Protein backbone atom coordinates (compact mmCIF):
# COMPACT_ATOMS: atom_id res chain seq x y z
CA UNK A 1 0.00 0.00 0.00
CA UNK A 2 1.21 3.55 -0.80
CA UNK A 3 2.81 5.47 2.10
CA UNK A 4 0.29 8.25 1.49
CA UNK A 5 -2.58 5.90 2.35
CA UNK A 6 -3.23 7.34 5.80
CA UNK A 7 -4.10 10.69 4.22
CA UNK A 8 -6.84 9.00 2.18
CA UNK A 9 -8.28 7.13 5.14
CA UNK A 10 -11.68 8.19 6.45
CA UNK A 11 -13.66 7.21 9.52
CA UNK A 12 -17.27 6.27 10.09
CA UNK A 13 -19.36 4.37 12.59
CA UNK A 14 -20.40 0.82 11.77
CA UNK A 15 -23.97 0.20 10.64
CA UNK A 16 -26.25 -2.81 10.14
CA UNK A 17 -25.27 -3.14 6.47
CA UNK A 18 -21.64 -3.73 7.48
CA UNK A 19 -22.29 -7.08 9.20
CA UNK A 20 -21.05 -9.35 6.41
CA UNK A 21 -17.90 -7.28 5.76
CA UNK A 22 -17.17 -7.05 9.51
CA UNK A 23 -17.66 -10.79 9.99
CA UNK A 24 -15.28 -11.51 7.11
CA UNK A 25 -12.61 -9.12 8.34
CA UNK A 26 -12.88 -10.50 11.89
CA UNK A 27 -12.52 -14.02 10.49
CA UNK A 28 -9.12 -13.02 9.19
CA UNK A 29 -8.03 -10.87 12.16
CA UNK A 30 -9.15 -12.98 15.13
CA UNK A 31 -9.05 -16.77 15.44
CA UNK A 32 -12.21 -16.62 17.56
CA UNK A 33 -15.74 -17.59 16.62
CA UNK A 34 -18.07 -14.74 17.48
CA UNK A 35 -21.80 -15.50 17.08
CA UNK A 36 -24.03 -13.59 14.64
CA UNK A 37 -25.81 -11.98 17.60
CA UNK A 38 -22.52 -10.27 18.47
CA UNK A 39 -22.07 -8.78 15.00
CA UNK A 40 -25.69 -7.63 15.20
CA UNK A 41 -24.97 -6.00 18.56
CA UNK A 42 -21.78 -4.16 17.66
CA UNK A 43 -23.21 -2.79 14.42
CA UNK A 44 -26.53 -1.59 15.87
CA UNK A 45 -26.35 -1.03 19.64
CA UNK A 46 -25.47 2.59 20.47
CA UNK A 47 -23.89 1.46 23.74
CA UNK A 48 -20.87 0.62 21.58
CA UNK A 49 -18.40 2.93 19.93
CA UNK A 50 -17.92 0.92 16.76
CA UNK A 51 -15.66 2.82 14.41
CA UNK A 52 -14.45 1.84 10.94
CA UNK A 53 -11.46 3.12 9.02
CA UNK A 54 -12.16 3.18 5.30
CA UNK A 55 -9.98 3.43 2.22
CA UNK A 56 -11.40 4.18 -1.23
CA UNK A 57 -14.79 3.00 -0.03
CA UNK A 58 -13.90 -0.18 1.79
CA UNK A 59 -13.37 -0.95 5.45
CA UNK A 60 -9.70 -1.57 6.21
CA UNK A 61 -9.79 -1.38 10.00
CA UNK A 62 -12.06 -1.11 13.00
CA UNK A 63 -12.14 -0.53 16.72
CA UNK A 64 -15.08 -1.57 18.86
CA UNK A 65 -15.26 -0.30 22.43
CA UNK A 66 -17.72 0.12 25.29
CA UNK A 67 -17.68 2.91 27.87
CA UNK A 68 -19.22 1.57 31.07
CA UNK A 69 -19.39 2.01 34.81
CA UNK A 70 -16.68 0.37 36.92
CA UNK A 71 -19.25 -2.08 38.28
CA UNK A 72 -19.50 -3.67 34.82
CA UNK A 73 -15.87 -4.85 34.76
CA UNK A 74 -15.75 -8.65 34.88
CA UNK A 75 -14.28 -10.29 37.97
CA UNK A 76 -11.01 -11.29 36.33
CA UNK A 77 -10.14 -7.58 35.97
CA UNK A 78 -12.07 -6.22 38.93
CA UNK A 79 -8.91 -4.67 40.36
CA UNK A 80 -7.92 -2.28 37.56
CA UNK A 81 -9.46 0.56 39.59
CA UNK A 82 -8.28 -0.63 43.02
CA UNK A 83 -6.74 2.77 43.83
CA UNK A 84 -9.79 4.70 42.57
CA UNK A 85 -12.58 5.04 45.12
CA UNK A 86 -15.11 7.05 43.09
CA UNK A 87 -18.43 5.33 42.42
CA UNK A 88 -18.95 7.31 39.20
CA UNK A 89 -15.74 6.04 37.63
CA UNK A 90 -16.09 4.64 34.14
CA UNK A 91 -13.80 2.58 31.95
CA UNK A 92 -13.61 1.86 28.24
CA UNK A 93 -13.21 -1.77 27.18
CA UNK A 94 -11.75 -2.41 23.72
CA UNK A 95 -13.64 -5.44 22.41
CA UNK A 96 -11.90 -5.51 19.04
CA UNK A 97 -9.11 -3.72 17.17
CA UNK A 98 -7.85 -4.79 13.76
CA UNK A 99 -6.45 -3.51 10.49
CA UNK A 100 -6.29 -5.33 7.12
CA UNK A 101 -2.84 -6.98 6.81
CA UNK A 102 -1.57 -5.02 3.79
CA UNK A 103 -2.57 -1.73 5.46
CA UNK A 104 -0.71 -2.30 8.72
CA UNK A 105 2.22 -0.12 9.79
CA UNK A 106 0.68 2.96 8.15
CA UNK A 107 -0.75 4.50 11.32
CA UNK A 108 -4.30 3.27 10.97
CA UNK A 109 -4.34 1.29 14.23
CA UNK A 110 -2.91 4.37 15.93
CA UNK A 111 -5.67 6.49 14.40
CA UNK A 112 -8.37 4.11 15.60
CA UNK A 113 -6.96 4.12 19.15
CA UNK A 114 -6.59 7.91 19.13
CA UNK A 115 -10.14 8.22 17.87
CA UNK A 116 -11.43 6.17 20.82
CA UNK A 117 -9.51 8.53 23.15
CA UNK A 118 -11.06 11.53 21.36
CA UNK A 119 -14.51 10.03 21.70
CA UNK A 120 -13.91 9.46 25.41
CA UNK A 121 -12.64 13.05 25.82
CA UNK A 122 -15.72 14.36 23.96
CA UNK A 123 -18.34 12.13 25.59
CA UNK A 124 -17.03 11.10 29.04
CA UNK A 125 -14.17 13.51 29.80
CA UNK A 126 -14.66 13.61 33.55
CA UNK A 127 -15.47 10.06 34.60
CA UNK A 128 -13.75 7.62 32.25
CA UNK A 129 -10.47 6.76 33.95
CA UNK A 130 -9.04 3.76 32.09
CA UNK A 131 -8.98 1.87 28.79
CA UNK A 132 -8.41 -1.88 28.92
CA UNK A 133 -8.30 -4.82 26.54
CA UNK A 134 -7.34 -8.47 26.25
CA UNK A 135 -4.73 -9.92 23.91
CA UNK A 136 -3.24 -13.38 23.18
CA UNK A 137 0.07 -13.72 25.05
CA UNK A 138 1.76 -14.75 21.77
CA UNK A 139 0.55 -11.66 19.87
CA UNK A 140 3.85 -9.77 19.96
CA UNK A 141 2.82 -7.36 17.23
CA UNK A 142 -0.20 -6.18 19.21
CA UNK A 143 1.67 -6.23 22.53
CA UNK A 144 4.44 -3.99 21.16
CA UNK A 145 1.85 -1.66 19.68
CA UNK A 146 0.11 -1.25 23.02
CA UNK A 147 3.26 -1.07 25.18
CA UNK A 148 4.64 1.61 22.88
CA UNK A 149 1.39 3.50 23.46
CA UNK A 150 1.61 3.57 27.28
CA UNK A 151 -0.59 0.55 27.96
CA UNK A 152 0.67 -1.52 30.87
CA UNK A 153 0.33 -5.26 31.33
CA UNK A 154 -1.99 -5.93 34.27
CA UNK A 155 -3.10 -9.57 34.43
CA UNK A 156 -2.05 -12.94 33.14
CA UNK A 157 -5.07 -15.01 32.15
CA UNK A 158 -4.32 -18.71 31.74
CA UNK A 159 -6.33 -20.50 29.05
CA UNK A 160 -8.51 -17.40 28.63
CA UNK A 161 -9.15 -17.94 24.94
CA UNK A 162 -10.56 -20.86 22.98
CA UNK A 163 -8.66 -20.81 19.70
CA UNK A 164 -9.93 -23.35 17.14
CA UNK A 165 -10.61 -25.96 19.80
CA UNK A 166 -7.52 -25.35 21.91
CA UNK A 167 -7.15 -23.10 24.97
CA UNK A 168 -4.61 -20.27 24.91
CA UNK A 169 -3.38 -17.71 27.45
CA UNK A 170 -4.23 -14.00 27.47
CA UNK A 171 -3.04 -10.70 28.96
CA UNK A 172 -5.04 -7.77 30.23
CA UNK A 173 -3.55 -4.40 29.20
CA UNK A 174 -4.59 -1.14 30.81
CA UNK A 175 -4.06 2.55 30.06
CA UNK A 176 -5.01 5.04 32.76
CA UNK A 177 -6.52 8.31 31.53
CA UNK A 178 -7.61 11.65 33.04
CA UNK A 179 -5.56 10.94 36.18
CA UNK A 180 -6.81 7.39 36.72
Amino acid sequence: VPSSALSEVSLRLLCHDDIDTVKHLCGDWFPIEYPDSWYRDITSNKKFFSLAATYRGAIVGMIVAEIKNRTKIHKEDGDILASNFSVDTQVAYILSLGVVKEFRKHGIGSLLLESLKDHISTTAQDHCKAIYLHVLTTNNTAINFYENRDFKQHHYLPYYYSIRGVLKDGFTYVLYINGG
Binding site: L97, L133, H134
Partner: peptide, 4 residues
Protein backbone atom coordinates in the same frame (compact mmCIF):
# COMPACT_ATOMS: atom_id res chain seq x y z
CA UNK B 1 -9.81 -9.22 21.17
CA UNK B 2 -12.61 -10.22 23.49
CA UNK B 3 -12.94 -13.88 24.40
CA UNK B 4 -16.12 -15.86 23.73
Amino acid sequence: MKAV
